[PDB]
């Protein structure tokens, strides 16, 4: 019968109370978000700086509980240098009655691409960063997991430009959708894993030019911006649309041809423009996969096939379809926390 597990101490971080194991010291506020908040801390077992995410009221609803469970399972499953992973998971709770939240411990990353975007990117820096993005995507895709909301704010980077993908596998009024694939925005055919490769294309274009590639105040406005770049698609593509109205709209447009991408991107190398052309492709069956993109000459200076690993096993969340009670989800989560091993 306890207030918290032995070896836990209570401390305020960013004016909220955290409960941490003795082994994590000097907690320092990093940020507050939609599902929790993050601090940095020193693991006195090594002196390594780590990030700790405190989940905020994950058991407030079945929705939040389910997301918390899936996130924990996803982070545990993936084992790849360019995919954010878990060093540790803990809760101060001593029982289910006491179980209100838990904490994820992760490699500390200084910043993210959104924060350093606009700063000047040599093509070498773009090669390096995009290569790492694509290795991470190859890996999660190979486990049957897509990101679906890849954007610069989800790409963590450190001082050495090492990169890790955040917030994968967890995907109104007018939220920004600048990096989302057209087939997702318009739901005009079913998407495959290359939805994320569209996003890579958008992010790479922005690193090249300094400007967001596509914006728009509504979906049709954004589509108009996209077609300025892709050209109005022809017969092979149009036949694949499952939205009759969208098809008719496309067939009724001024039928403006695509590219030249070396003209659209006047400062890009031929290999950069060629890769962009193959990622910013409306046809989801022709768009490059991550594995294919990694073989492109743009990455020749950095390519190491040995680093381009696949997940040995598919991500398997049996309870993904299940509708359980918060108490039931708690037990599942509670169990998953105990079983963890670094």
UniProtKB/Swiss-Prot annotation:
InterPro entries: Kinase-like_dom_sf, MAP_kinase, MAP_kinase_CS, MAPK13, MAPK_p38-like, Prot_kinase_dom, Protein_kinase_ATP_BS. Keywords: ATP-binding, Cell cycle, Kinase, Nucleotide-binding, Phosphoprotein, Serine/threonine-protein kinase, Stress response, Transcription, Transcription regulation, Transferase. Gene3D superfamilies: Phosphorylase Kinase, domain 1, Transferase(Phosphotransferase) domain 1. It holds the Pfam family Pkinase. Residues 24-299 form the Protein kinase domain. GO terms for molecular function: ATP binding; MAP kinase activity; protein serine kinase activity; protein serine/threonine kinase activity. It catalyses: L-seryl-[protein] + ATP = O-phospho-L-seryl-[protein] + ADP + H(+); L-threonyl-[protein] + ATP = O-phospho-L-threonyl-[protein] + ADP + H(+). The modification Phosphoserine is found at residues 46, 341. Dephosphorylated by dual specificity phosphatase DUSP1. A motif (TXY) lies at residues 172-173. GO terms for biological process: cellular response to anisomycin; cellular response to hydrogen peroxide; cellular response to interleukin-1; cellular response to sodium arsenite; cellular response to sorbitol; cellular response to UV; intracellular signal transduction; positive regulation of inflammatory response. One of its GO terms (cellular component) is nucleus. Its cofactor is Mg(2+). It comes from the Eukaryota. The active site is at residue 149. Activated by phosphorylation on threonine and tyrosine by dual specificity kinases, MAP2K3/MKK3, MAP2K6/MKK6, MAP2K4/MKK4 and MAP2K7/MKK7. Activation by ultraviolet radiation, hyperosmotic shock, anisomycin or by TNF-alpha is mediated by MAP2K3/MKK3. Inhibited by dual specificity phosphatase DUSP1. The modification Phosphotyrosine is found at residue 173. It is an enzyme of class 2 (transferase). ATP binds at residues 30-38, 53. Serine/threonine kinase which acts as an essential component of the MAP kinase signal transduction pathway. MAPK13 is one of the four p38 MAPKs which play an important role in the cascades of cellular responses evoked by extracellular stimuli such as pro-inflammatory cytokines or physical stress leading to direct activation of transcription factors such as ELK1 and ATF2. Accordingly, p38 MAPKs phosphorylate a broad range of proteins and it has been estimated that they may have approximately 200 to 300 substrates each. MAPK13 is one of the less studied p38 MAPK isoforms. The TXY motif contains the threonine and tyrosine residues whose phosphorylation activates the MAP kinases. Interacts with MAPK8IP2. Belongs to the protein kinase superfamily. CMGC Ser/Thr protein kinase family. MAP kinase subfamily. This is Mitogen-activated protein kinase 13. It comes from Homo sapiens (Human). The lineage of its organism: Eukaryota, Metazoa, Chordata, Craniata, Vertebrata. The gene is MAPK13.
């Amino acid at each position: 019968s306890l207030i918290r597990k032995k070896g836990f101490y209570k401390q305020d971080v960013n004016k909220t109370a955290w409960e941490l194991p003795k082994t994590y010291v000097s907690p320092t506020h990093v940020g507050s978000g939609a599902y929790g908040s993050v601090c940095s801390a020193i693991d006195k077992r090594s002196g390594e700086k780590v990030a700790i995410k405190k989940l905020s009221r994950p058991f407030q609803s079945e929705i939040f509980a389910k997301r918390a469970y899936r996130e924990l399972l996803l982070l545990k499953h993936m084992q790849h240098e360019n995919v954010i992973g878990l060093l540790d998971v803990f809760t101060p709770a001593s029982s289910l009655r006491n179980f209100y939240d838990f904490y994820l411990v992760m490699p500390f990353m200084q910043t993210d691409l959104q924060k350093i975007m606009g700063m000047e990117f040599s093509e070498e820096k773009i090669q390096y960063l995009v290569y790492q993005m694509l290795k991470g995507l190859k890996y999660i895709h190979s486990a049957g997991v897509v990101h679906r909301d890849l954007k610069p704010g989800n790409l963590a980077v450190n001082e050495d430009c090492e990169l890790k993908i955040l917030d994968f596998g967890l995907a109104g009024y007018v939220v920004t959708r600048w990096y989302r694939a057209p087939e997702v925005i318009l739901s005009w055919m079913h998407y495959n894993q290359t939805v994320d490769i569209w996003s890579v294309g958008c992010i790479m274009a922005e690193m090249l030019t300094g400007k967001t590639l596509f914006k728009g105040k509504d979906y049709l406005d954004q589509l108009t911006q996209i077609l300025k770049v892709t050209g109005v698609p022809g017969t092979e593509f149009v036949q694949k649309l499952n939205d009759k109205a969208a098809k008719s709209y496309i067939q009724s447009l001024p039928q403006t041809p695509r590219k030249d991408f070396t003209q659209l991107f006047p400062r890009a190398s031929p290999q950069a423009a060629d890769l962009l052309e193959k990622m910013l492709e409306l046809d989801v069956d022709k768009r490059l996969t991550a594995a294919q993109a990694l073989t492109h000459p743009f990455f020749e200076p950095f390519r190491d096939p040995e680093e381009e690993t696949e997940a040995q096993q598919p991500f398997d969340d049996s309870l993904e379809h299940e509708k359980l009670t918060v108490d039931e989800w708690k037990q599942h989560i509670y169990k998953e926390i105990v079983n963890f091993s670094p």
